[PDB]
Ligand binder design. Structure first.
Ligand SMILES: [Ca+2]
Length: 181
C-alpha cells in the first residue's frame, strides 16, 4: 500500500484515530530502505502496542480476518488480526511478500490454536516468529511452545513440513483482499 494513501486516509478521520493513521504512515516512510532486522523489530513492537482483543466466545480468535485499516480504526484485534497488519506493514516497507507467511500453530503454553507471522530470511531458512504474545523475535526452534500446522500468504498454503512449493491462495485470503480495496 502507499504512505500517500494513508495520508489520504488520515484526513478522513480525527481524534485517537487520525493520528494512529499518521503514526502508521510515518512508520512505513521511516522504515523504507532500512535493514530487515530493524524493520521486523520496529513493526512488531509498533503493533504489539495495540489492543489485544479476545473473542468472548472462543476465548481466542474469531472467524473474521480484520483488514489493516480496520485494525487501525478499531485500535486492535486478535492474534490472527495482529499477524495480518504486521504482514501488510512489512510488505509496504519493502520486505518481499514471499518471505512472509501467516502461520497457524498449536500452542502448548496457551493450550489452544495461535496465529503468528513467520519471516523467512532465505527460502530454506527456519523462520523468525513475530508473535503478538511474545516481544522476543525468535527462531522456530527457539519456539518449542509452537507447533505449526499450516501457513499461508498471497501466494499459497503450506501444510506444516511442506518445504518449498505451495501445498495447493485460500478463498478467505481473496475475500480479505477484496475487502481491502
Ligand atoms: Ca480476527
Amino acid at each position: 500500500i502507499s504512505v500517500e494513501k494513508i495520508q489520504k486516509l488520515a484526513q478522513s478521520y480525527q481524534g485517537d484515530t487520525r493520528k494512529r493513521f499518521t503514526a502508521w504512515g510515518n512508520l512505513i516512510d521511516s522504515l523504507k530502505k532500512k535493514p530487515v532486522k530493524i524493520q521486523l523489530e520496529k513493526v512488531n513492537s509498533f503493533f504489539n502496542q495495540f489492543n489485544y482483543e479476545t473473542d468472548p466466545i472462543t476465548g481466542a480468535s474469531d472467524d473474521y480476518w480484520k483488514s489493516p485499516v480496520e485494525f487501525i480504526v478499531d485500535g486492535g484485534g486478535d492474534c490472527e488480526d495482529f499477524a495480518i497488519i504486521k504482514y501488510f506493514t512489512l510488505v509496504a516497507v519493502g520486505v518481499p511478500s514471499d518471505q512472509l507467511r501467516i502461520t497457524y500453530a498449536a500452542s502448548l503454553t496457551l493450550n489452544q490454536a495461535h496465529m503468528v507471522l513467520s519471516f523467512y530470511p532465505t527460502p530454506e531458512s527456519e523462520p523468525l516468529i513475530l508473535d503478538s504474545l511474545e516481544s522476543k523475535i525468535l527462531k522456530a526452534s527457539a519456539r518449542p511452545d509452537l507447533k505449526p500446522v499450516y501457513s499461508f500468504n498471497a501466494e499459497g498454503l503450506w501444510l506444516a513440513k511442506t518445504r518449498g512449493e505451495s501445498s495447493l491462495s485460500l478463498g478467505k485470503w481473496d475475500a480479505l483482499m477484496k475487502r481491502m480495496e
